[PDB]
Amino acid sequence: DRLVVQTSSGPVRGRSVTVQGREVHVYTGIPYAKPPVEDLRFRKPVPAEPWHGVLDATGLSATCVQERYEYFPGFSGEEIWNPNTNVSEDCLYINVWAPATTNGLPILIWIYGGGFMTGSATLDIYNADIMAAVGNVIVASFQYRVGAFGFLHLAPEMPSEFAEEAPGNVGLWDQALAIRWLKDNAHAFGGNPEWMTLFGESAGSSSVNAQLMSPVTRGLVKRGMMQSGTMNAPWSHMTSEKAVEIGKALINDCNCNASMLKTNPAHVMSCMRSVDAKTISVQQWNSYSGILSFPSAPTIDGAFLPADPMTLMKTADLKDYDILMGNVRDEGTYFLLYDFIDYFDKDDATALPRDKYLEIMNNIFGKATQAEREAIIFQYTSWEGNPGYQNQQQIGRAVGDHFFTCPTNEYAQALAERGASVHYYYFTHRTSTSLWGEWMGVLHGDEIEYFFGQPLNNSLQYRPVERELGKRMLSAVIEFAKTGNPAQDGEEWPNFSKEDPVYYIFSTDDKIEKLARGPLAARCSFWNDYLPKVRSW
Amino acid sequence: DRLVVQTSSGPVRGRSVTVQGREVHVYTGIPYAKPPVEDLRFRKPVPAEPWHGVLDATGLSATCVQERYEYFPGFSGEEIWNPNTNVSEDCLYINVWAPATTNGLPILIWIYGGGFMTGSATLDIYNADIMAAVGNVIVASFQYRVGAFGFLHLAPEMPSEFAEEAPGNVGLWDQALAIRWLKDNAHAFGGNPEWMTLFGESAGSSSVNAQLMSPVTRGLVKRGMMQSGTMNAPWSHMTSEKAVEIGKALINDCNCNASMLKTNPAHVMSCMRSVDAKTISVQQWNSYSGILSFPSAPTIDGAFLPADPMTLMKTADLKDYDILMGNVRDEGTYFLLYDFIDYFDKDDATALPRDKYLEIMNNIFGKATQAEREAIIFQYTSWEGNPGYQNQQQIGRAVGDHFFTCPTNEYAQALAERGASVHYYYFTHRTSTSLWGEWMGVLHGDEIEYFFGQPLNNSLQYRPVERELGKRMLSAVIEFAKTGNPAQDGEEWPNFSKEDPVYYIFSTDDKIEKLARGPLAARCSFWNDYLPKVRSW
Numbered sequence A, B: 001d002r003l004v005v006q007t008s009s010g011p012v013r014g015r016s017v018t019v020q021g022r023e024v025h026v027y028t029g030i031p032y033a034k035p036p037v038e039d040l041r042f043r044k045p046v047p048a049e050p051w052h053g054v055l056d057a058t059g060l061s062a063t064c065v066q067e068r069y070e071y072f073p074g075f076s077g078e079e080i081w082n083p084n085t086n087v088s089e090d091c092l093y094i095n096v097w098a099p100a101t102t103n104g105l106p107i108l109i110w111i112y113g114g115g116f117m118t119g120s121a122t123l124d125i126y127n128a129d130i131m132a133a134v135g136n137v138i139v140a141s142f143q144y145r146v147g148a149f150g151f152l153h154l155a156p157e158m159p160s161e162f163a164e165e166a167p168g169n170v171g172l173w174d175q176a177l178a179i180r181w182l183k184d185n186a187h188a189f190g191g192n193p194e195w196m197t198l199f200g201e202s203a204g205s206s207s208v209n210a211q212l213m214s215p216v217t218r219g220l221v222k223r224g225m226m227q228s229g230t231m232n233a234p235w236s237h238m239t240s241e242k243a244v245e246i247g248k249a250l251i252n253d254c255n256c257n258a259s260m261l262k263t264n265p266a267h268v269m270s271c272m273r274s275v276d277a278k279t280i281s282v283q284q285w286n287s288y289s290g291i292l293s294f295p296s297a298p299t300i301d302g303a304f305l306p307a308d309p310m311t312l313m314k315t316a317d318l319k320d321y322d323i324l325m326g327n328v329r330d331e332g333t334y335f336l337l338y339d340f341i342d343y344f345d346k347d348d349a350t351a352l353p354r355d356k357y358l359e360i361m362n363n364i365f366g367k368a369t370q371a372e373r374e375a376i377i378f379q380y381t382s383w384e385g386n387p388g389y390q391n392q393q394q395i396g397r398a399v400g401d402h403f404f405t406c407p408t409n410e411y412a413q414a415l416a417e418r419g420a421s422v423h424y425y426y427f428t429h430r431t432s433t434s435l436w437g438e439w440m441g442v443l444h445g446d447e448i449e450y451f452f453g454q455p456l457n458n459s460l461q462y463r464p465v466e467r468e469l470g471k472r473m474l475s476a477v478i479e480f481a482k483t484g485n486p487a488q489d490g491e492e493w494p495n496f497s498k499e500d501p502v503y504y505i506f507s508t509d510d511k512i513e514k515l516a517r518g519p520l521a522a523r524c525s526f527w528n529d530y531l532p533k534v535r536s537w
């Protein structure tokens, strides 16, 4: 078959789609690791046993075990992020979209987000059909273990012998393993293996970050696109000691004692591999208190992540790295609606009084000092623009700014200082069909479909300028993948640095100035310059 | 003569002016105290010895001893605030403007400003001709001792016996004495003595404040207009211990030892009364380090000012007090140009770099903690609006806001809470003929002429809307004087309180909303709410 490709591990058969007037060959569900199941739960992934026989790569693969948000039962806007294939631990599968400088096609690799607890390469929104077809590039995506399955971290609690029992970050080992698989097999799909670009969003973006900077993997890929996610972000890294404590709680939470981890770890681990995945899937969430602070995150392990993400950079040079990164306008709105659903509504705005503005602010930042809390509350106090609506708008800004936009900004400046050619974007279009509430603005993740070129899909409802924006945002990705520079011919989009923190604005509004420096600079000046000084007692 | 009026101390003869089509009788230079000279230097004023014979009250009286700012030699804009009659210690004279509810005319009494170091009732700008004529009210002004002459404070350094040797605040005793004189003689000028209104600007405004609230005088006048000056303001009150230290330096500075103040005060005081006034006039300024922190100020004396101005209010009710108060848009520009003339220009704006923005900010607020300095510097950091020009604009705002607008705001809220009917205004018109630099905006004191009705003077150059504004601002004063309420017929101008900090905006722009709450509330929220909390270690 011409839909058959001989991979490193055996022949695979795929589908043929014709989108945007070009043939793509779509291979979905290729095992890249042995199913991380039974004895291999919590462990590093091991390469998949080779096969022979055409492997059916025409259906979607499984979704790694996770829980579905049902805060709005039946609301399409929530469940399009829920798993759309069966959930199972057997989930380590790769997807390749392959069209029908000169030694093969560029390969783009997508890592999804979902806070290291959720997410799946199989979501419609991550369909690489159009990107591959129009970009004329190889696009690949894959599942990686999330939640406690990907991030249970207990090795310090156990003797040397039991290191590989629960080393932590195996979800990042998964990604490492799938990217290795794609390098190995780039040529078999018409792809140039030295021409690879990682890209992702939220936790996927931070994972792009980890894969570029980890000693375990660094050098393999040196060109990445990070959408609203950087490892310095508070939700995207976690100490080993906190990870262990979460792990110890989970072990207890699944009725497995955990106080025997030192005296007899092997038995505690057997117990945890006998637990049904659904039980882990639920009990891991007991350790979630704090908006945007998940129990699973890239963990300082002296291995994949050997130091805290900002002490990594003071010593490694990045002159050969190309980085495209950015943010959406309202990063924090849906996190705030979910974590404070008692206060807020999905569809309409909330006139939030001043005491309940304080109630929420003082909670979100309860772990900062009160000199920070007072400073933050003062920085986000509305005075104009009709109260209440404005207060909700400011708490959203604060969440977005503290958790995504300003960490991204800070990491973008640190990447530029060590030589990386950084390009920064800011996404400010609220899609016309968005059925999230108007007050929620331009949601975290709203940009993913645009960068994938989905507005080019004439079967989904979009306005002509939105299809223009999708064609522009996909083209920024394809040009970044192809040249390390997102800028089109004659389009001005200069490098981002501390000296000139210029970013590109993606909007349908042809009246705005596309290049801007000041507004993000001021927003995040508070978080990245002034607030550190407040923290000095 | 019909220009002759029999006062408490003898007959006085004045002038007849006809302005705005009404006859006014203008008596200038009426002694209200014995010349505070030789033995009476530094002492409380004593009532003037009665005379007989028509006293020539047709010329301007002397100016109390002070120094003239010559920062711009020949610039009319500076020297119209310099003394325009001879400077001398013999200066305690009153002025009455008297036209040609029902028991006499209202009496308005003007107290000039000049930082308790300068100023004179004789300035053209304080001409009450139009106000009296158009308002059809009695207007009075008078000289009061300024500088060390009015405020040398040494009684704590000396035994009980020598209390009256240098009690301090004699300049406020002067004003007390002239207001008493005007009550005594209100009827002789056609004025109703129970119908008196104090009004003033800068230090005069704070003096209006002191005269309304001092136990020495309170009850006499219960209706006042305070323009950019309140006693809580940092430049408008001073402890006794700091006053003594200033006094001790001056005594040393005039070559009189000062370390003998306790062992033999009488000799140290003789020495200081032998010093030429010009020497005191100069050496008192040696104790001026710090913008807006003059060596002379209303001093806590357990007498005229028995406590710190904000601990006074927590115990006295003001239900019968009417207070009209307010601010100009750019309170701090000329103070900043004078104290930082090396940096800035009179006519054109300064592109102030960021390090020199810090140089000035860190100096002006050098005495605040660094947690305040960092907070203030962050609160006034420009990001947009073209740098440099913007930085100068923000340091001006900070000075204006910290030194006048926010203390006034704070005192206005405290006055309303204790029952006073407060009305708040905000003056935002830059006069067309202003030959100060455009960047200096609407200067501190720019409003005085408008409230005096000077734009009604057809011989000075003003635009028609400026004459409208003068006619409106004079009418706010006359209506406030007559009814305790500045509001015209059908004009909405509601009471100012913490609950509803609404103010009236005086502008020639007919496009703005005259009533506003939010913009001052936000400006001063920083100074009056948030910064106090920063001050907590």
Ligand SMILES: *[C@@H]1O[C@H](CO)[C@@H](O[C@@H]2O[C@H](CO)[C@@H](O[C@@H]3O[C@H](CO)[C@@H](O)[C@H](O)[C@@H]3O)[C@H](O)[C@H]2NC(C)=O)[C@H](O)[C@H]1NC(C)=O
Binding pocket: A019, A127, A129, A130, A457, A458, A459, A460
């Ligand atoms: C563009 O947008 C349209 C929707 O407007 C997308 O159409 C969707 O295509 C997928 C796959 O082609 C359909 O899923 C399939 O369903 C059948 C049975 O219903 C199943 O046998 C397949 O294995 C697959 O699961 C989906 O139903 C369809 N939805 C609609 C509303 O048409 C299209 O994929 C988008 N992308 C492009 C590049 O056109």
Ligand SMILES: Ic1cccc(CNc2c3c(nc4ccccc24)CCCC3)c1
Binding pocket: A069, A077, A078, A081, A113, A114, A115, A117, A118, A119, A201, A202, A334, A335, A338, A443, A444, A445
């Ligand atoms: I972690 C997390 C916290 C709260 C809600 C969710 C639900 N999943 C969601 C995801 C994304 N966008 C969404 C937009 C609206 C509502 C839910 C979304 C994009 C990437 C991660 C998953 C996940």
Ligand SMILES: Ic1cccc(CNc2c3c(nc4ccccc24)CCCC3)c1
Binding pocket: B069, B077, B078, B081, B113, B114, B115, B117, B118, B119, B201, B202, B334, B335, B338, B443, B444, B445
């Ligand atoms: I204290 C002080 C500090 C700096 C400059 C001066 C000069 N005197 C001045 C006064 C007033 N307005 C002015 C406007 C521009 C320039 C100088 C002005 C109004 C009342 C006090 C005196 C006084």
